[PDB]
């Protein structure tokens, strides 16, 4: 059941428009509805740090630094700049994708690698875990107080 | 006053108030893509599940995905790596629109081997707009400072 | 580029071709929407940032009001603005999220002391920000990823 009018196009599934037309797929003056389905084959235009077609000429120093740093490789670059060097390549009002979510994260680092001899760093993406460990002479504990996830550090023994 | 045009390139709906600027108010599905005319895309899902959800098939899962699926520490966090029947192809492809609900489940897990004032290990989730504070304790001074971009937390004897 | 609307809905086939599975086809049908490798632009989810002047204190939850009024949280995406009932979120789960929403995602990092200063510390850790755990006088701080866990260890030097 496909219907078109001055306000747009609407497709009502074999069974029904559902509560509040939630089961309706449409493109009308009121926007878009996917009817409980998905929007596939879509990209936001966002790139990952380290990706091939980065334009260093229009970049800020911070963005270029991250683009070239392996510690950031793979993280989504929410700040790529285009021509004028002021306007975001990708505008705020652009649908984000699951692939953009997969590259979301922050970098964690330390000047020393445990049992190592080099600096340390890794990415903390969705569902990654960071653990603060007690060590010789130091007790590290956690507790969520009034919403704050507090990690306390004290002398042991 | 609204009109719907169909031409070689696609379908464009111009609201009763004009195409706006750069067709910004326009709602369209054309060869160049889709415009929601400053509005939203509603009644949409990406197919992403939260860890701990039902209908998770343990036999197509990697050890890491399954562990998180069964660990209460991860419960409710969005699962971005669910695999399909072939055990390698993601159930949700990259080029799929993400939803606000997917965002609501984003987060990492913070833990410690001890609970402050307690006697068991600690863990909680850090989602959007959650705060993590590193506190000084007896004999140790914990301070922070943003330097050269880095949020640096320093630890020293008091 | 052939555009057409029939009983099934809207389908736009590029001059070039459909694709390995009609991946280049742009469509609006019973199965949902396909962007044919393009973007969805001029779109908003309706999410606001904390500290936005348009916020309503009267319908706010205790927690949300707290964050709306804590400058440490300013700019971060507000994923829990409540409507009248305060029992329902202004923005529903099944609403496409935007790149602008991603840009405001982040967590607050804080400490009760500012290194070399004399006040409390706080900043936001958004996507691609870096958090470093520093060794100080007497304490050695090291990192290592073990069995997937990003572990930071504290011990007396």
| Domains parsed from chain A with CATH numbers | 1-38 (2.20.70.140), 39-128 (3.90.1780.10), 129-157 (2.20.25.140)
Q: How far is CA A49 from the centre of its chain?
A: 12
Phi, psi of C122 (to 5 degrees): -170, 150
The shortest C-alpha distance from A134 to chain B (Å) reads 7
The shortest C-alpha distance from A16 to chain C (Å) reads 12
**In angstroms, rounded to a whole number, what is the distance separating the alpha carbons of residues A9 and A26?**
6
Q: Which two tokens stand for residue B72?
A: 């209460």
Tokens 């081997």 map to which residue?
Answer: B113
What residues form DSSP beta bridges with B55?
A: none
Tokens 């989602």 map to which residue?
Answer: B127
Question: What is each CA distance from C25 to A28, C76, C96, C100, C124, in whole angstroms?
Answer: 20, 36, 21, 27, 41
Compute the residue count for chain C.
157
Q: Which two tokens stand for residue B33?
A: 């893509």
Whether residues A130 and B108 touch (CB distance < 8 A) is answered with yes
Selected residues 79-138 of chain B with any CB under 8 Å from a CB in chain C:
95, 97-104, 106, 111, 126-136
What residues form DSSP beta bridges with C28?
A: C10, C33
Q: Is B52 on the interface with A (CB under 8 A)?
A: no
C131, A109 contact by CB (below 8 A): yes
Q: Which two tokens stand for residue B142?
A: 């914990």
Q: Is B153 on the interface with A (CB under 8 A)?
A: no
**In angstroms, rounded to a whole number, what is the distance separating the alpha carbons of residues B42 and C149?**
37
Closest partner CB to A45 (pick from C6, C39, C132): C39
**In angstroms, rounded to a whole number, what is the distance separating the alpha carbons of residues A32 and A95?**
12
- A89 in helix, strand or coil? coil
**In angstroms, rounded to a whole number, what is the distance separating the alpha carbons of residues A44 and B29?**
15
What residues form DSSP beta bridges with B73?
A: none
Stretch (H or E) spanning B68:
helix B63-70
Chain B CB contacts of C50 below 8 Å: 129
Q: Radius of gyration of chain A from Cα atoms?
A: 24
Number of H helices, E strands in chain B: 2, 13
Q: Which two tokens stand for residue C119?
A: 């006040």
**In angstroms, rounded to a whole number, what is the distance separating the alpha carbons of residues A118 and B109?**
25
Phi, psi of C20 (to 5 degrees): -55, -5
**In angstroms, rounded to a whole number, what is the distance separating the alpha carbons of residues A94 and A100?**
12
Q: Which two tokens stand for residue B7?
A: 């031409």
**In angstroms, rounded to a whole number, what is the distance separating the alpha carbons of residues C140 and B155?**
8
E-assigned strand segments in chain C:
2-6, 9-13, 26-29, 32-38, 40-43, 48-49, 77-78, 106-111, 113-114, 121-126, 130-135, 139-146, 149-156
**In angstroms, rounded to a whole number, what is the distance separating the alpha carbons of residues A142 and B138?**
15
Q: Is A16 on the interface with C (CB under 8 A)?
A: no
C28, A9 contact by CB (below 8 A): yes
Of B126, B87, A83, B156, nearest to C108 by C-alpha is: B126
Experimental technique behind these coordinates: X-ray
Stretch (H or E) spanning C99:
helix C99-103
Question: What is each CA distance from A95 to A76, B14, C42, in whole angstroms?
Answer: 14, 21, 9
Question: Which resolution, in Å, applies to this structure?
Answer: 2.1
B105, B134 contact by CB (below 8 A): no
Of C124, C130, C143, nearest to A49 by C-alpha is: C130
Question: For A11, left (φ over 0), alpha (ψ -120 to 50), or beta?
Answer: beta
Phi, psi of A68 (to 5 degrees): -95, -10
Q: Radius of gyration of chain B from Cα atoms?
A: 24
Stretch (H or E) spanning A10:
strand A8-11
Phi, psi of C154 (to 5 degrees): -120, 125
Q: Which two tokens stand for residue C34?
A: 């396909």
β-strands C32-38, C26-29 pairing: antiparallel
DSSP A141: E
Q: Which two tokens stand for residue A103?
A: 């590259």
């Amino acid at each position: 059941k496909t219907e078109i009018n001055k306000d747009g196009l609407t497709i009502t599934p074999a069974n029904g428009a559902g509560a509040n037309n939630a089961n309706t797929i449409s493109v009308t003056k009121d926007g878009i509805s996917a009817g409980g389905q998905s929007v596939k084959n879509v990209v936001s235009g966002l790139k990952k740090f380290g990706d091939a077609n980065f334009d260093p000429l229009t970049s800020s120093a911070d963005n270029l630094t991250k683009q070239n740093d392996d510690a950031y490789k793979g993280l989504t670059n929410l700040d790529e700049k285009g021509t004028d060097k002021q306007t975001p390549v990708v505008a705020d009002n652009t649908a984000a994708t699951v692939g953009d979510l997969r590259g979301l994260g922050w970098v964690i680092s330390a000047d020393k690698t445990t049992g190592g001899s080099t600096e340390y760093h890794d990415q903390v993406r969705n569902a990654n875990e960071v653990k603060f460990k007690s060590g010789n002479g130091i007790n590290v504990s956690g507790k969520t107080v009034n919403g704050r996830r507090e990690i306390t550090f004290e002398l042991a023994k």
